[PDB]
Amino acid sequence: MASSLSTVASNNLMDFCSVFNLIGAIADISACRCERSAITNAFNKVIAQTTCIVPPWSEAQDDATEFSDAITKVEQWLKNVNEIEIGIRPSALLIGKVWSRFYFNLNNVADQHKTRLYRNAEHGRMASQSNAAKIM
Amino acid sequence: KIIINLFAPNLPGSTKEDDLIQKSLRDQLVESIRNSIAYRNVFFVDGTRGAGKTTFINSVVKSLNSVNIKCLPTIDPTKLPRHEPILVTVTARLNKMVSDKLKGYWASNDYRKQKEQWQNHLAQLQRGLHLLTDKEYKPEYFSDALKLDAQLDYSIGGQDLSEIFEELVKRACEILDCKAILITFDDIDTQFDAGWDVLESIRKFFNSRKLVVVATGDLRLYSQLIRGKQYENYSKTLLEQEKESVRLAERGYMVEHLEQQYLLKLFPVQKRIQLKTMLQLVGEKGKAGKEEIKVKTEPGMQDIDAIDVRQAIGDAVREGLNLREGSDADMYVNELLKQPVRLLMQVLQDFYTKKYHATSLSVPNLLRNALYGSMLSSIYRAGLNYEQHRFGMDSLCKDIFTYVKQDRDFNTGFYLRPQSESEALRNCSIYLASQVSENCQGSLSKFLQMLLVGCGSVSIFNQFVTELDREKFEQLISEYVAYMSVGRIESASHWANRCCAVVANSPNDEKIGVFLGMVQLNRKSRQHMPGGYKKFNIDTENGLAKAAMASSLSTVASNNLMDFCSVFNLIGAIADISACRCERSAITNAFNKVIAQTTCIVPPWSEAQDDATEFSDAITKVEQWLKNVNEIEIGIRPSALLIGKVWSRFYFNLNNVADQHKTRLYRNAEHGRMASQSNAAKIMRFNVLAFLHAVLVEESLYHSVSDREYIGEGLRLNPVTSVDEFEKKIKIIGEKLKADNKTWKNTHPLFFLLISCPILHPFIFPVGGINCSVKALNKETSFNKLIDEIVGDKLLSDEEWDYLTKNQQIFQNTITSLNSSTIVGASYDKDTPAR
Amino acid sequence: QAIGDAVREGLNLREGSDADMYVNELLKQPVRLLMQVLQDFYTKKYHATSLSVPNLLRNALYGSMLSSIYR
Ligand SMILES: Nc1ncnc2c1ncn2[C@@H]1O[C@H](COP(=O)(O)OP(=O)(O)OP(=O)(O)O)[C@@H](O)[C@H]1O
């Protein structure tokens, strides 16, 4: 979530969590693939080095062992992926198409779960109750 | 193997058999023409501007010089007399080698007959040459076309110079006992208008089978030449009468559709070859090298120790910019490889020649001179300062402002990232980074000025003045640069004294008198104030507290004089005290440089012990600090990315503090001990910490004196409310440096010097800003001893620190009364909610 | 089938409308432009076989409709 946790620097500190930054996280891990630096620095790329301002056109315990533990999991991920990722071949059509599948899925999920919040929906077990975690 | 000698003219005439950068293409093309003639036939090499064309096209002729093909000397369309048919110069060149053949062989019976046959066609061609130059038809010449010659067969009547030249070359081949004649052209980059006659003649007269043509030029430039000649066919009246966009669209398509196929008639697609750029030959870091290149950096070296080309640029980029070894340094060398070979070689030739000459002493100084001449054209296009001896931080800070407006990016503009769209801005970005690391090198006072007035002047305009169609935005920059005087700054403190006025004219919700990095101490007394709150008074403090408080002040005249407490002034003041050590009283003047003659004005864009030795002890502490910095000023090697990265962290960290500690004033701010309590002095303690914490993260992350960082694998944040996370960063770094057996000076020169400045000492531990709780002390007590570890001697007396922990004694290095001061608009009404 | 082996693997397409449309859009091209892009394949791929097949197509296309890029 830390990578997805983006803070908009303005007159008020506004913070957002988005699925795109999850997409934008994995899409950059495989770029370097080595040196144990880009992958480690990927976990902190918006904390203080990305302060987006609203556009002018608008109207406005120890974490030491757990940090090195989490890094090797994506290092575990890369060596298993690299043994098959060459045999697959995409193209123009069937890569734009899946985005339309993805883009419309986001719209429907956001629209439906927008009004599915209640005072007792936190970790709600009802098929209709929803919270912030249910959106994600 | 390629060995490039940098101490060589590198001209096309001074090439060798091993110094050729491109050899596979030279060899590969040679057999292709031979196989074509073994059993139109117009070749075409395609070359990026500066790839290497005239040198390359000379090598292929050399290969064909030693089936048998005879090659004519290379002809340059640019270096030819104007108003001269190109059929003439080919015939004249052809005649020379044929006339050399006739007087060569020994037999006389054939020579007397062969010469007569050769001259029969020359006279035929000469009398028919008037068609190429005449502007109008002569009715007399009709009787000349009707007259048929003898002994020669012409399948087509008339003049028809196409067959006459075709018959001429056929007889020219018999005398030269060859299979075909090689005609080679040259590039027309210098004047591409002259290249129109080349294309016109090739498609008309060189249509035989024993002629092979090898053109050369820039393909993207030929298209603009042909398209211009297509429009000349349309009648000018039609081109004006029918201006409808519906007709204009189809007219433009027809022109494009015509010359697209026209170029295919001249140069077939399968015949076109390209010259690979400098990048496509060596290859990137990840992939293997196709054809490696080794260069001779120093003169008179053995061929064994020849350095690679990438290491020959990393020797300059990494060292000339003081940029640490990493992927970011690879950004520049990758961009430099994509540049044309002619530009890249001249940059490499000049830098290494001067470095050897200097050795027989500043590396960035030698690189800056090389970059100035190379991209002088892009400097003039962008309008940057270009006078040689007017260099300095005053000009450089103006230069970086011009670049940002051109790039239209206020977020990463001061990073100087070569990622712009226009080629001119990319050249300016790399050039500016060279100048940033030249003046800033080996100086602390120069470093802060670049950070404060150079980088800072862009961020302030982005958020507070830009929000005030682009034509109106244009004059705002014009008067803003005049107001704050980016072109010429009298003192770093005066910029901060002007920075506050710029940002003060931007109110906020509920009009709390706290701003980005500053608070507004009330200059008067409001009736019936609760608790011990009162009006701020400088005379309450003593010793270093008054001196530190004197620097951190600024006033603005806005029909009622407003007082300001600032962090920017403290940053600027240090950049002035650390300027020159040759005088003692200068630092005393720096203490009260602005406190007396401020008289600041609202910007146009906005409508509205003994007193003899009172500071004697303060001067000694500052004077001792002068010896410490002056012995370390050599070590510091700031880069063009370090300063940009430091400021960005500062901007986010400082923006958070000024926002969270805004509603946290609930009548119990005075004598604050719990983290929820927050008074005016609490904000100022954190802002100074926000400056030093921002330096700590980026100093280790990016610096030329450290190969690897010592922060370690771990998430980083900013101390908005809690100093605990800032405490562990120093503790962890202290552990790592101990294992490597390294000191503090030779690893973090910036952090060590700032933390030892006597001026910043009192603001770290104020009276009313220190957090005191059950767990607040736990982190703070280690933090207090951690700061003592960095400095050689003890920071403060133990008893003084004890009083701050619990809740009379005089404080020399601690502010005593800023905590109780009020804030304009901060009407103390609510109460602290506790649970 | 001589354009089928030119788009299906040149553009990484399977048997379908897109592969058949691209043959049609390579058929609406003038015969002069159809030869050169087609000739570039079998001439170059014979040298390769004595791969970068989709890149080999882009090599042929670059010299095929180069001028329309400027529009
Ligand atoms: N073998 C080589 N080694 C190093 N640099 C070379 C080599 N061959 C060419 N160069 C570089 O290319 C330059 C030659 O220019 P180039 O061959 O691109 O001709 P041009 O300027 O386009 O042609 P012209 O002047 O005939 O119109 C040299 O000055 C040098 O900078």
Q: What is the largest CA-CA distance in chain C?
A: 38
Q: At what angle do helices B492-504 and B568-577 cross, to 10 degrees?
A: 170
* Residue B264: its H or E element: helix B245-266
Angstrom distance (rounded) from CA B650 to CA B662? 19
Angstrom distance (rounded) from CA B414 to CA B399? 11
Which candidate, B365, B346, B342, places its Cα nearest to that of B355? B365
- The pick from B59, B341, B350 for probing ligand 1's pocket by mutation, whose C-beta has the most ligand atoms within 8 angstroms, reads B341
Q: Is B53 in the pocket of ligand 1 (CB under 6 A)?
A: yes
Peptide-bond breaks in chain C following residues (C–N over 2.5 A): 50
Indicate if the alpha-carbon torsion angle B661, B667, B669, B675 is positive or negative: negative
Phi, psi of B496, rounded to the nearest 5 degrees? -60, -40
Q: Are B559 and B572 in contact (CB under 8 A)?
A: no
Please return the burial class of B420, using the count of CB atoms within 10 Å of its CB with bins 0-12, 13-18 and 19+. middle
Which candidate, B426, B434, B336, B334, places its Cα nearest to that of B381? B426
CA atoms within 13 A on the CB side of B506: 20
Q: Is C11 on the interface with A (CB under 8 A)?
A: yes
Q: Is B709 in the pocket of ligand 1 (CB under 6 A)?
A: no
Angstrom distance (rounded) from CA A35 to CA A40? 9
What Rg value do the Cα atoms of chain B yield, rounded?
39
Q: Is A96 on the interface with C (CB under 8 A)?
A: no
Angstrom distance (rounded) from CA B12 to CA B57? 10
Nearest residue by C-alpha to atom 27 in ligand 1: B187
Angstrom distance (rounded) from CA B724 to CA B795? 20
Phi, psi of B46, rounded to the nearest 5 degrees? -115, 125
Q: Which residues are CB-contacts of B489 (< 8 A; sequence separation ≥ 6)?
A: B394, B397, B449, B453, B495
Q: Is B693 on the interface with A (CB under 8 A)?
A: no
Interface with B, mutate which of A47, A52, A63, A73 (most B CBs under 10 A): A47
CA of C57, closest CA in chain B: separation in Å? 13
CA of B41, closest CA in chain C: separation in Å? 15
Type of residue found at B827? S
Residue whose entry in the numeric block shows the structure tokens 């805004």: B662
Interface with B, mutate which of C36, C67, C71 (most B CBs under 10 A): C67
**Of A11, A13, A67, which is closest to B656 when you measure between CB atoms?**
A13
Structure-solving method: cryo-EM
CA of residue B50 to ligand 1 center, whole Å: 7
Q: Is B4 in the pocket of ligand 1 (CB under 6 A)?
A: yes
Angstrom distance (rounded) from CA B419 to CA B331? 9
Taking the CB of residue B172, how many other CB atoms lie within 10 A of it? 22
CA atoms within 13 A on the CB side of B634: 2
Q: Are B479 and B435 in contact (CB under 8 A)?
A: no
CA of residue B57 to ligand 1 center, whole Å: 10
DSSP bridge partners of B518: B515, B566
Taking the CB of residue B160, how many other CB atoms lie within 10 A of it? 15
Which residues in chain B have their CB less than 8 angstroms from residue C63's CB? 269, 272
CA of residue B10 to ligand 1 center, whole Å: 8
Q: Is C34 on the interface with A (CB under 8 A)?
A: no
Residue of chain C nearest B257, judged by CA positions: C68
Q: And the tokens for B529?
A: 């104030």
Phi, psi of B183, rounded to the nearest 5 degrees? -110, 120
Q: And the tokens for B114?
A: 């062969």
For the residues of B523-556, what is the DSSP string, one character each? SS--SS--TT-B---GGGS-THHHHHHHHS-EEE
DSSP bridge partners of B259: none
- Which own/partner pairs from B468-474 qualify as long-range (CB within 8 Å, at least 24 positions apart)? B468/B605
User: Are C13 and A90 a contacting pair at CB < 8 A?
Assistant: no
DSSP letter at B452 equals I
Angstrom distance (rounded) from CA B241 to CA B238? 5
Residue of chain C nearest B249, judged by CA positions: C71
User: Are C32 and B260 a contacting pair at CB < 8 A?
Assistant: no
Q: And the tokens for B592?
A: 């009260």
User: Are C11 and A90 a contacting pair at CB < 8 A?
Assistant: no
Phi, psi of C61, rounded to the nearest 5 degrees? -65, -35
Please return the burial class of A85, using the count of CB atoms within 10 Å of its CB with bins 0-12, 13-18 and 19+. exposed
Nearest residue by C-alpha to atom 30 in ligand 1: B342
What are the C-alpha distances in Å from B342 to residues B21, B140, C56? 12, 55, 30
Which residues in chain C have their CB less than 8 angstroms from residue B259's CB? 67
Q: Is A25 on the interface with B (CB under 8 A)?
A: no
What are the C-alpha distances in Å from B683 to residues A12, A25, B518, B688? 17, 35, 9, 9
Q: At what angle do helices B327-338 and B309-320 cross, to 10 degrees?
A: 120
- Which own/partner pairs from A22-31 qualify as long-range (CB within 8 Å, at least 24 positions apart)? A29/A74, A29/A77, A29/A78, A30/A78, A30/A81
Q: Are B512 and B826 in contact (CB under 8 A)?
A: yes
- Of all atoms in ligand 1, which is nearest to the CA of residue B21? 1
Angstrom distance (rounded) from CA B433 to CA B399? 11
User: Are B269 and C70 a contacting pair at CB < 8 A?
Assistant: no
Beta pairing class for B600-601 and B554-557: parallel
What Rg value do the Cα atoms of chain C yield, rounded?
12
Q: And the tokens for B340?
A: 């044309």
C-alpha B278: how far from its chain's center?
20
What are the C-alpha distances in Å from B185 to residues B45, B49, B176? 10, 16, 21
For the residues of B716-772, what is the DSSP string, one character each? ----SS-SHHHHHHHHHHHHHHHHHT--STTT-HHHHHHHT-TTTHHHHS-SSS---
First to last CA, chain C: 32
Angstrom distance (rounded) from CA B800 to CA B814? 9
Phi, psi of B821, rounded to the nearest 5 degrees? -70, 145
Residue whose entry in the numeric block shows the structure tokens 């129109």: B196
Q: Which residues are CB-contacts of B680 (< 8 A; sequence separation ≥ 6)?
A: B519, B521, B565, B669, B818, B819, B821, B822, B823
* B689-713: burial string, b at 16+ Cβ within 10 Å, e else: bbbbbbbbbbbbbbbbebeebbbbe
Which candidate, B126, B57, B65, B120, places its Cα nearest to that of B91? B126
Q: Is B167 in the pocket of ligand 1 (CB under 6 A)?
A: no
Q: Is B50 in the pocket of ligand 1 (CB under 6 A)?
A: yes
Angstrom distance (rounded) from CA B678 to CA B721? 9
Please return the burial class of B732, using the count of CB atoms within 10 Å of its CB with bins 0-12, 13-18 and 19+. middle
Q: Are B650 and B729 in contact (CB under 8 A)?
A: no
Which residues in chain A have their CB less than 8 angstroms from residue B713's CB? 40, 64, 67-68, 71
Angstrom distance (rounded) from CA B718 to CA B232? 67
Q: Is C28 on the interface with B (CB under 8 A)?
A: no
Please return the burial class of B607, using the count of CB atoms within 10 Å of its CB with bins 0-12, 13-18 and 19+. exposed
Cβ–Cβ pairs < 8 A, chains A and B: 53
Q: Are B449 and B575 in contact (CB under 8 A)?
A: yes
DSSP bridge partners of A24: none
Q: And the tokens for B478?
A: 């014009």
Q: Is A71 on the interface with B (CB under 8 A)?
A: yes
Sheet arrangement for strand B180-184: B69-71, B180-184, B211-217, B42-46, B272-274
- Which own/partner pairs from B324-331 qualify as long-range (CB within 8 Å, at least 24 positions apart)? B324/B639, B324/B702, B324/B703, B324/B704, B324/B706, B324/B707, B325/B707, B326/A37, B327/A32, B327/A38, B328/B641, B328/B702, B330/B285, B331/B417, B331/B418
* B292-317: burial string, b at 16+ Cβ within 10 Å, e else: ebbbbbeeeeeeeebeebbebbbbbb
Q: And the tokens for B768?
A: 């009313």
Indicate if the alpha-carbon torsion angle B796, B801, B803, B804 is positive or negative: positive
Q: Are B184 and B195 in contact (CB under 8 A)?
A: no
DSSP letter at A53 equals P
DSSP letter at B509 equals G
Nearest residue by C-alpha to atom 31 in ligand 1: B342
